[PDB]
Write a protein that binds this ligand. Structure first.
Ligand SMILES: Cc1ncc(C[n+]2csc(CCOP(=O)(O)OP(=O)(O)O)c2C)c(N)n1
Ligand SMILES: Cc1ncc(C[n+]2csc(CCOP(=O)(O)OP(=O)(O)O)c2C)c(N)n1
Ligand SMILES: Cc1ncc(C[n+]2csc(CCOP(=O)(O)OP(=O)(O)O)c2C)c(N)n1
Ligand SMILES: [Ca+2]
Ligand SMILES: [Ca+2]
Ligand SMILES: [Ca+2]
Ligand SMILES: [Mg+2]
Ligand SMILES: [Mg+2]
Ligand SMILES: [Mg+2]
Ligand SMILES: [Mg+2]
Ligand SMILES: [Mg+2]
Ligand SMILES: [Mg+2]
Ligand SMILES: [Mg+2]
Lengths: 524, 524, 524
């Protein structure tokens, strides 16, 4: 067998059947004789390729396979890799290298010092020393990406390798099963369980790795047993809890002082599947107030190491959540009372308040809808106004890198064909990966894109106005016609200048047979 | 003085007055109180920011200053940095880091292991150890980018540094003059000159560093004195010679065998300002045929080291070209005869042959026009059909990374307001950095964009059809309306489905007061 | 031909005939059939291997070739590479890698991520993608190390590569000549010369690159013409000037304030072949006092970039020194008056004052002796008491990394068989690379080692006593018998407990036919 044949067999035997890519000449020898059981999803720029694959992996809870062109293609994707790193997305990123005979002279398209290019945003990064090593290297990539803590990996392959003879002993790679589905030993788990049972006023904080593990339901059981309020860790990339469950308390403010104040009076705080903590704004104060002890369960040693406070346990979130939910006592305390519904913001017949948009989306969207957020100034309100009962219902750029939601929403919709995906994206954010729209059109992936148009980088005006920063350039983005951009890439386009039009536009979009973009005129 | 004040003073004292950027919160403390003598050029995505700055630097022959947002913004720009590396573009790339107090906990927007992110695509990459070091670090960045061989550099700055007190001793940085304007010592230069004088059938090969140094005219004198044919080194990022000069022989094929065959019978081949050589296609054979000796003058030690053949001299191209042109004897040999005009390709009343487009552009464009090329399957014909008499008249992605020409054409037009810029870009390539169009609209930079629409990644179909590669996915890009995309970003749009319409569309574009995009229907 | 045969031919054609090494199994396929025209110099530890090669390269003014074993051998040498980096030593460091077939599984002795190991202490670091690329890669290593600014480079080679067929086109590598022997263009050089001619009170500061270039004599002429005092830049790795020449003013203190005070009243300070400046102690103040302008000529862009003050010119030191010395006017000013001889320190019949040792060495050593210094607390006095008339007469660890002088003194003596090498090394420093002694014994390289034994890390007690640092552990090194260590490695050993014995011991050592170690009892 050839390296080509062996590698594709390894991929299919490991459950991979889709290649997200933007092709180049170094990659043609890999893509030729493309297996009929595989499917190729083209995107027009590499940030889009990786964004789509990322959404697909996060929603499918399995690795996604990517193929890019050498250094330039890899480089175009590096902003997208910074989100993937933060979201622990299992992405296998492959890139074509020049033929081995021309690497030395650094012919056009040589990826120089290739393995170093994507660092430090990958778990593993490699170029094999020979053609026959390629299948083995691919095996390593698959498993490195898939093991906890999951993350992106990078493999560079000289284009002449594919046609070379494979090592017959590579067959041992095909069916390898690698598990990191582990939890704390019985003795120490019993100690933890007793600490939770003994807490007088426990609180629970959940991060994105809960949703990634589909540990949501186990966490619901855990919170019900402990009669504990549940928060989502700050800068949340996913939603790990039903947002209308009686225990739910919403998204934590991303500040040190704010969080310690919030946790005051809680004697034991159990954090599951989150860094401790993904703060954003500088908000100096105490990490924890006297009387509060913190215990973190994380799948990532790097998270456990850098927590400024508390104990930590490094284990699989699915395994740990299930064990805890089934071991803890049912507290005799009263179940927390559900949070009241959000207030209705006054809305005239003109431009839309973001709050109005979210309320309307909540009213009209199916109960199993999936939302993506890249409307940076409206996150707090979004979290308060969308009832998300099911797992996998929310995604937000994990590293804060814009250009995620638009392509990721396409990958999510591909992963979940029966759940309507609705991406709420600011007019600023929409441009970063605008060309992703074409993929939705071409493959008829029926994502709905809601563009919140207020003509400015709103979150920046806020961050600025705060530090009283004056005379800051580059904050306004006037003069973009999103209906025209949608037409450019073959996506049906609608406009909503008021509530009447927003409702009508959503009705049409929800009925449509393909992707739809709605440009919403929002208040400045 | 503050670090902010000191740094801006250093920048202006070193000739920098423009910031190309896409802002983020880590950068607001740098951008606040933006100096009134500076101007900020916003682009909507970082590949575009860097592309624009790159075109500006290459055309202006001076460093360009860039400001990006942390890791995600830097990462979005890394494909653009791969071109900049290959073109020796003096780019000072700065990126905002989280406040020092929050770096440890890895708060949202922390650029982790920041200096390693852009490697290996930068000459120098650094984050200062303290606020007061920032001006010094900026000084280093300016000079590292500017010294031969020029290239991109990276500086990460924690956002809290800007408001801190500067070291008063930083004033010594302001007026530092650093020179690498050097040439071979007299003794060895005399030896080289004698070798050139003694050659019976010399040839000259010129690369992009000739145009960067504005050594074009000196090279013309050198070729006239030596009565030598002149080629452009393969995969040319710039044009280093008047394309209708009697000595000009055009663009060399990017193959080992092709080049040695081309140089056969030439006893001395002098290469100036090029790698030896930027081959592309695998084309095995002899590096040089018996009887041919090669001498390379390059500004880059890395180029000199990796040449598989010939002698090399590492020096400034401007200094070396001037010295050689003024020292060599006037050969009594006959001046080479100019190349004949290209053939006129048969053209019906339907879709345009690329050859027709280039002929028409040559007929109608001003004699001092500047062209950019990202129409990958038509490069050979473009080089044959455009009369480029002046320096700085051609740019092509130096690392072959698409997404360069569209934004770079905007930067070039900004650098050269009196020379009409015309970017010829394929329908595939146009998408990578499509959002750059907005910058042209917003700042009224009157670049003309000619989109060659054939609905496919044509160069890939060629590279494939060659290696008889069958069943390759992802090669077609149907369903893009470029007039709509232009409208989306506020750029006047025209369509040309035939020659009559192409002429009319060019007449209108050349008369227009702002940027114009022409979608040309080209043959499949 | 094989890769083995081709590589050795390349080495000999490029002037390499010696391999400094400590062998391992990955290297046996390279070392087998060792060419009879080559010679192998074994050392017992890798810090010693590299130290010896470093001294050899610095003294010979040509590249030295090193062969180490995989990661562990390379790693053992990394302290030595840190000195080599700072001294711009042209070292070609090769290391054996596992066979390509076993790299993937990471068999014992696999050098993982090999190219990254020696960073950031090398100019270039690489592992070839195939066997046939090895000769080309070696070519690159040779030239990267040899081009200005010179420095160490690293090449990792899988052991199975050597027996493979070489590319016949590799013959083009054999005779490549690469030059960086460049100087400032005529126009700007004339401007510099006029500035020097116009100076009312010029000063000259010289660094190690002067001695490396053998520009010493040209600098003498330059100083005589300008009638200028001459200093050696701080933390000097070499001696660039005759220390008894009337213009000589000695070693500059390694402090910011001290240097600006020293240069006060000098209107133009010309620095040649030094960083600006290699300060050590924190000594805050003005970089330069008002009235002083600085101009630096350096072979290293990294030096030019980081200078906190002055103008800079990046060029070859030999070419620049020669040009300046021959272009400047003869000033009518009076030649500086020679520095008075150092005072004679009172010396009783007991333990030796370091000053006594240096005075005695100066009295007894031949006029063409070469000294190495790793007696860290006595450097200032050494510089004042040794008359060094000739180039290549002094070496001191360029990065301050101990373990340099002992092995380097062996390499220097190998390079200069007719000049007596005398290494003055502290009792602390002597241990770092003690096993190097064996190489001197085995090859009968007649270096004299003078061990200054005061039983303590004297320089550290000083640096401590200064910052009033109390209760510092680990500063004393009692209980070492250096005569026994010398006997252990087969080197003749003598002891000097007083002046009478020091004179007798030196008389014997200077007459000896092989290496000699003298343990001198110095004052605590
Ligand atoms: C790749 C990248 N570039 C820049 C930024 C900085 N940034 C953060 S929020 C923001 C504004 C986004 O504006 P929009 O999408 O319109 O939403 P709004 O803030 O108006 O709600 C910017 C530019 C970023 N996070 N990522
Ligand atoms: C960032 C990047 N992605 C992918 C490629 C691979 N590539 C090279 S040419 C090409 C096709 C370009 O098509 P178009 O711009 O329409 O020009 P045509 O080839 O049709 O003339 C592609 C995808 C690249 N060079 N850079
Ligand atoms: C590899 C290395 N380790 C440690 C040091 C720190 N150091 C600098 S001077 C010194 C003392 C050297 O003592 P000795 O050689 O006896 O000379 P003395 O200071 O007594 O004159 C030490 C340990 C260093 N420079 N390099
Ligand atoms: Ca907005
Ligand atoms: Ca095309
Ligand atoms: Ca001592
Ligand atoms: Mg157990
Ligand atoms: Mg599915
Ligand atoms: Mg990197
Ligand atoms: Mg000269
Ligand atoms: Mg201009
Ligand atoms: Mg000159
Ligand atoms: Mg010698």
């Amino acid at each position: 067998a050839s390296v080509h044949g062996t590698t594709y067999e390894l991929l299919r035997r490991q459950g991979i059947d889709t290649v997200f890519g933007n092709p180049g000449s170094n990659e043609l020898p890999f893509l030729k004789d493309f297996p009929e059981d595989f499917r190729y999803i083209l995107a027009l720029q590499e940030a889009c390729v990786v964004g789509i694959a990322d959404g697909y992996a996060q929603a499918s809870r399995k690795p996604a396979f990517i193929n890019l062109h050498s250094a330039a293609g890899t480089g175009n994707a590096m902003g997208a890799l910074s989100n993937a790193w933060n979201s622990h997305s299992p992405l296998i990123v492959t890139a074509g290298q020049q033929t081995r005979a021309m690497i030395g002279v650094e012919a056009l398209l040589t990826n120089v010092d290739a393995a170093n290019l994507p660092r430090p945003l990958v778990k593993w990064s490699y170029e094999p020393a020979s053609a026959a090593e390629v299948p083995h290297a691919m095996s390593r990539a698959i498993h490195m990406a898939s093991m906890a803590p999951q993350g992106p990996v990078y493999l560079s392959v000289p284009y002449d390798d594919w046609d070379k003879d494979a090592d017959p002993q590579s067959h041992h790679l095909f069916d390898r099963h690698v598990s990191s589905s582990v939890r704390l030993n019985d003795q120490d788990l019993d100690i933890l369980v007793k600490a939770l049972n003994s807490a007088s006023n426990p609180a629970i904080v959940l991060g994105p790795d809960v949703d990634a593990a589909n540990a949501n339901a186990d966490c619901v059981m855990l919170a019900e047993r402990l009669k504990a309020p549940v928060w989502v860790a700050p800068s949340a990339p996913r939603c790990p809890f039903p947002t209308r469950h009686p225990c739910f308390r919403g998204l934590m403010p991303a500040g040190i002082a704010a969080i310690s104040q919030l946790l005051e009076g809680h004697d034991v705080v159990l954090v599951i599947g989150a860094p401790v903590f993904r703060y954003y704004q500088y908000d100096p104060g105490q990490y924890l107030k006297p009387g509060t002890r913190l215990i973190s369960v994380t799948c990532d040693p790097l998270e456990a190491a850098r927590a400024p406070m508390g104990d930590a346990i490094v284990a699989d979130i699915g395994a740990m959540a299930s064990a805890l939910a089934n071991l803890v006592e049912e507290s005799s305390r009263q179940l927390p009372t559900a949070a009241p519904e959000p207030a209705k913001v006054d809305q005239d017949a003109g431009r839309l308040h973001p709050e109005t948009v979210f309320d309307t989306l909540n009213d009209m969207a199916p109960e199993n809808a999936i939302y993506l957020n890249e409307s940076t100034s409206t996150t707090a309100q979004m979290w308060q106004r969308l009832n998300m009962r099911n797992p996998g219902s929310y995604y937000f750029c994990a590293a804060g890198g814009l250009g995620f939601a638009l392509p990721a929403a396409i990958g999510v919709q591909l992963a979940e064909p029966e759940r309507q995906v609705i991406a709420v994206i600011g007019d600023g954010s929409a441009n970063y990966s605008i060309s992703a729209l074409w993929t939705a059109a071409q493959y008829n992936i029926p994502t709905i894109f809601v563009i919140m148009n207020n003509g400015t980088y709103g979150a920046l005006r806020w961050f600025a106005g705060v530090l009283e920063a004056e005379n800051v350039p580059g904050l306004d983005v006037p003069g973009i016609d999103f209906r025209a951009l949608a037409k450019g890439y073959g996506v049906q386009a609608l406009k909503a200048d008021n509530l009447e039009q927003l409702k009508g536009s959503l009705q049409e979009a929800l009925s449509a047979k393909g992707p739809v973009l709605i440009e919403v005129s929002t208040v400045s």
